[PDB]
């Protein structure tokens, strides 16, 4: 089984810069029949199958932009991009395409650098097809800001609020490299209804002062 | 163009069996061979096999030899994977694609696998709309809570694809053995409520589909 080991892991780069990934083999991939090497290079965007890009190591499929570049012979690939753009976040696989068994490369991930941004905070209070389910949720959403790094903080009552909370992030976002995240706060019905005052507070490096979001559910 | 659309089942129970179909459309199913390819965890590639649909001829990775059969029907253009004994190491996405000269150059969208003694659960699906007392703003996030669901492929639909932009899928999370994920979108507030929004739940694994219309708190 040939062994394919891609280098670095991650890297992060900003808009415009040029990368250079390392996928190295153990043994070597050259047809010396076909004076062709067959290594393949494949791009995964999130929730997507995998896209092929290169292959033979140097030949780009129609369609590929020639920002995207790939080189090297024997056991010593890399793929390079010349003018990174936030379209290119995803992990890079490359593939040994010459012997049985066909073996990948673990993937090496392009991830994005933009200003840091702050969020954009909005609050929801529980629907009234999830009260009649008797569930309630309050979900706040933070949308596009950067870096990854939030910190949510749910009150209910001035109170503080931490067994119900769920997080989750999207991936990082093709257009402006921002990240959201949805927190949510589930209560039953019966407790979301003990009280009046709800609450989620973003606190990013983009900012000291908190943002902060909350309704009265007797107002709702 | 080049088209592969893979079927089967996203639920199946452990040690029984599950035969995933790839259907070819846009070239000539017979000029080409059929790989598929395990991604376990959103994350690592396996070959698993290579099928020449004009002999039957099949390379298995040993790995896969007695749990995966390859298998073509040329009279439809349509490639099957049989997996057997189906055990937790199982569940994951199973994607074909068409290997030539230019290794795997089309891929399937692949059939997310999940090995299982749970039964099939279909979401509810929750409205997230500014309640209460809140700024119109210049723009306004909606959102949908989908909720309760198992197995996990589920997608969401904005106004039949009209605000696919703006839009933010955050990955589910799985608690107490069902699903949760939701949906935002950002819509300009001369649209909402003024026109109407509806989010769209598919949850193939149930033939289940859900509108879910977005409405105002009270009126403006």
């Known amino acids: 089984d040939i062994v394919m080991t891609q280098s670095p892991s991650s890297l992060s780069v900003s808009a415009g810069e040029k990368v250079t990934m390392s996928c190295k083999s153990s043994?070597?991939?050259?047809?010396?029949?076909?004076?062709?090497?067959?290594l393949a290079w494949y791009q995964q965007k999130p929730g997507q199958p995998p896209k092929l890009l290169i292959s033979?190591?140097?030949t780009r499929e129609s369609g590929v932009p020639d920002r995207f570049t790939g080189s090297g012979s024997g056991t010593d690939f890399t793929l390079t991009i010349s003018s990174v753009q936030a379209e290119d976040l995803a992990v890079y696989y490359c593939?040994?395409?010459?012997?049985?068994?066909?073996?990948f490369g673990a993937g090496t991930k392009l991830e994005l650098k933009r200003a840091d941004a702050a969020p954009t905070v909005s609050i929801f209070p529980p629907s009234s097809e999830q009260l009649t389910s008797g569930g309630a949720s309050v979900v706040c959403f933070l949308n596009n800001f950067y870096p990854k790094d939030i910190n949510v903080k749910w009150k209910i009552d001035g109170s503080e609020r931490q067994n119900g909370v769920l997080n989750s992030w999207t991936d990082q976002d093709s257009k402006d490299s921002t990240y959201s995240m949805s927190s949510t706060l589930t209560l039953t019905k019966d407790e979301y209804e003990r009280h009046n005052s709800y609450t989620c507070e973003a606190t990013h490096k983009t900012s000291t002062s908190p943002i902060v979001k909350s309704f009265n559910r007797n107002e709702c | 163009e080049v088209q592969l659309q893979q079927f089967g089942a996203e639920l199946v129970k452990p040690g029984a069996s599950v035969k995933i179909s790839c259907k070819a459309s846009?070239?000539?199913?017979?000029?080409?061979?059929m790989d598929w390819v395990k991604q376990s965890h959103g994350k690592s590639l396996e070959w698993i096999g290579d099928?020449?649909?004009?002999?039957?001829?099949?390379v298995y990775n040993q790995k896969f030899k007695g749990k995966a059969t390859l298998t073509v029907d040329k009279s439809s253009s349509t490639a099957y994977m049989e997996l057997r004994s189906l055990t937790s190491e199982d569940t994951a996405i199973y994607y074909c694609?068409?290997?030539?000269?230019?290794?795997?150059?089309?891929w399937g969208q692949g059939t997310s696998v999940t090995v299982s003694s749970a039964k099939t659960t279909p979401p509810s699906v929750y409205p997230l709309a500014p309640g209460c007392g809140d700024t119109t703003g210049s723009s306004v996030t909606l959102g949908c809570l989908v909720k309760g669901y198992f197995p996990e492929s589920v997608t969401v639909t904005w106004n039949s694809g009209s605000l696919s932009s703006s839009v933010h899928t955050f990955p589910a999370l799985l608690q107490s053995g069902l699903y949760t994920m939701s949906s935002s979108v950002t819509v300009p507030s001369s649209t909402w409520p003024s026109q109407t929004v509806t989010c769209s739940v598919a949850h193939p694994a149930s033939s289940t589909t859900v509108d879910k219309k977005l409405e105002p708190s009270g009126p403006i």
């Open positions: 694609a068409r290997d030539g000269a230019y290794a795997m150059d089309h």
């Open positions: 593939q040994n395409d010459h012997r049985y068994p066909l073996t």
């Open positions: 033979g190591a140097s």
């Open positions: 846009g070239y000539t199913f017979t000029d080409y061979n």
């Open positions: 099928i020449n649909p004009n002999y039957d001829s099949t």
């Open positions: 043994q070597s991939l050259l047809n010396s029949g076909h004076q062709k090497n067959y």
